[PDB]
Ligand binder design. Structure first.
Ligand code: MG
Lengths: 519, 51
DNA sequence: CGCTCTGCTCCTTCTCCCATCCTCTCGATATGAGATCAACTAG
DNA sequence: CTAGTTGATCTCATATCAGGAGAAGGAGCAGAGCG
């Protein structure tokens, strides 16, 4: 057995399975427990965070450290991964009672009875974020011990009802599992750190004034050098502030110690077809976009219309001229070529989409070919989602796995897939990141590559630029503060244009004080 | 109290966009400020902005 | 004789009001994904 | 009983001088009256 500082023992057989970084994470989690503080397991997608949590909880109950050992814990996760958590708990620590609070569930009686039973039995209640919002009256009356939030970046909006619900738990032991705990700006980081440890980053106004405006405003292309140094100063301050409670391991410092196969992250710049280009040019020349640029109307109509046009001209639905015909969209032509090549190479492909309608169009195109597909979007019943994933992970007869990035991403394991193609960019970089890490995970025995399709000179390239800027802003505070300024664009409201190509002894402390001011 | 629509009728004008009564716009402002204030209570906020 | 209790005029604020009825012209004035639930819609 | 399909509904997320008149309050002074 592994013996930690005070009284925490994790069983030897369980400990041996864990990797070096995973047991380092268990150590860190128990140091947080000693401090009675929350934390973020920021390890990227696929590095293993369900296993670290399961091992830490198993050692906490095993070690016998109100609550004797482990109390009644609640795990809030996306609906598609609830049964995944159940399976991992059963395989790794079968002694735990692990009930699902969901319509699928296993209880077949009043839910409130299930919450009461798990609370009074010191079991693990896995629930969804929607249920936490809905059952906040009952979920918080029972003095839970641990409130692990899997994919806790769903709490990123400080004013969302789910966030306010999840911030009602009285316990100090609040954990977030999310390999991307910053997706659009630093408000998200503040929301997460308000959840795990309400005090460190102060009130949201104060956090804005001290960190968000300095750090963000120093990343713009026109930033003055003094402002860049101020942003550096603030980013370093914030990194030091959030260091003890963020544990973020990359797949670069762990890849050598984990034997993952090679990865590629190509970004194809697809070409609008003549008809697609015509529709795009007609729309950017229309009066609606003119009204948008004048501030009269909301930008959403034009933005969504351009995204649809780049996806496929489903605005004006033009035999072999049915709705969604592949040859009318350039990205669909590229996807057809890629699918042909990969099928002749005997490989398995993971085809993502932001839009459900574009997913239906891709599904129709796949039946048009002889490819054997398998689809999972928000409409599929939750109870069948983990089965479906297992199916695609089990038999290699299934060639392509269609997905929406909101359901197909976000914590599922699809290591059976070999190639991954992100068909449509999103405004949030993190959606695309999780979608592309669905394949390159622990258990991937083959070389994976990511093909991220963008239409050249369209709104999609501008979205790619916006999310590159967001990723740079995130890296400025997650990996290093020396981040190069985003210079590719100014990120203004001219994304409506078509531009198709072709003890310290008071001296080290005083030195740090002197150096920081100089910055 | 929110008066009914007959007290603040909304008339379909020549332009298809509906026309709202003055009371309706005032009520919209009241709802906006009330919602913002209620937001600033469920999550704590400085007394200055609340005032 | 100190201290209070009116109280007296007076200046300040403030709020209200300002005929009835009729005619005409003229200017200004989003969209989809996911979740929940409830009705089926059948097995 | 009992799972799968169908609609409604909610949340959430994607960028960039030429009035006047009267009534109510407060102010300062003046005195009366009693400890
Ligand atoms: Mg996970």
């Amino acid at each position: 057995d592994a013996e930690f500082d005070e009284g925490f023992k994790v069983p030897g057989f369980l400990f041996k399975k864990l990797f070096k970084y995973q047991q380092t994470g268990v150590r860190w989690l128990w140091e947080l427990h000693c401090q009675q503080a929350g934390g973020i397991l920021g390890d990227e997608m696929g590095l293993g965070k369900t296993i670290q949590i399961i091992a830490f909880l198993a050692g906490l109950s095993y070690s016998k450290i109100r609550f004797e050992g482990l109390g009644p814990t609640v795990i809030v996760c996306p609906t598609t991964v609830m049964h995944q958590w159940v399976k991992e708990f059963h395989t790794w620590w079968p002694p735990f009672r692990v009930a699902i609070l969901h319509e699928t569930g296993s209880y077949t009686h009043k839910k409130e009875k299930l919450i009461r039973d798990v609370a009074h039995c010191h079991g693990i209640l896995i629930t969804s974020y929607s249920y936490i919002r809905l059952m906040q009256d009952d979920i918080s009356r029972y003095d839970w011990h641990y409130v692990i939030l899997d994919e806790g970046h769903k709490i990123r909006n400080p004013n969302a009802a789910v966030t306010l619900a999840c911030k009602q738990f009285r316990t100090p032991h609040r954990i977030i599992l999310s390999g991307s705990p910053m997706q659009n700006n630093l408000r998200e980081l503040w929301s997460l750190f308000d959840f795990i440890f309400p005090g460190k980053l102060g009130t949201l106004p104060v956090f804005m004034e001290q960190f968000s405006v300095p750090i963000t405003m120093g990343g713009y292309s026109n930033a003055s050098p003094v402002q860049v140094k101020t942003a550096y100063k603030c980013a370093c301050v914030l990194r030091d502030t959030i260091n003890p409670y963020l544990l973020r391991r990359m797949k670069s410092d762990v890849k050598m110690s984990l034997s993952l196969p090679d990865k590629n992250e190509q970004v194809l710049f697809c070409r609008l077809t003549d008809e697609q280009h015509k529709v795009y040019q007609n729309f950017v020349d229309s009066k609606e976009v003119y009204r948008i640029l004048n501030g009269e109307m909301q930008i959403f109509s034009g933005l969504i219309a351009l995204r649809k046009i780049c996806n496929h001209p489903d605005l004006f639905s033009g035999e072999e001229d049915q709705f969604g015909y592949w040859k009318r969209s350039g990205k669909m032509i590229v996807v057809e070529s890629l699918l042909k090549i990969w099928h002749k190479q005997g490989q398995r492909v993971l085809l993502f989409s932001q839009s459900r309608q574009m997913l239906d169009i891709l599904e129709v195109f796949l039946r048009a070919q002889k490819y054997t597909y398998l689809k999972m979007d928000g409409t599929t019943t939750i109870a069948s989602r983990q089965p479906l994933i297992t199916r695609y992970n089990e038999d290699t007869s299934i060639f392509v796995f269609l997905l929406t990035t909101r359901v197909g991403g976000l914590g599922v394991n699809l290591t059976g897939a070999n190639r991954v193609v992100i068909y449509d960019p999103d405004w949030n970089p993190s959606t695309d990141t999780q979608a592309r890490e669905r394949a390159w995970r622990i258990g991937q025995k083959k070389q994976v590559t990511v093909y991220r399709l963008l239409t050249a000179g369209t709104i999609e390239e501008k979205i790619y630029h916006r999310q590159i800027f967001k990723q740079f802003l995130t890296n400025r505070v997650l990996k290093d503060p020396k981040q190069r300024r985003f210079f590719k664009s100014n990120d203004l409201y001219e994304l409506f244009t078509l531009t198709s190509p072709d003890p310290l002894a008071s001296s080290s402390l005083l030195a740090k004080m002197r150096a920081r001011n100089h910055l | 109290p929110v008066p009914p629509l007959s007290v603040r009728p909304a008339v379909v004008m020549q332009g298809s966009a509906r026309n709202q009564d003055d009371l309706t716009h005032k009520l919209a402002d009241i709802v906006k400020i009330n919602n913002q204030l209620r937001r600033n209570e469920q999550n704590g906020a400085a007394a200055h902005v609340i005032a």
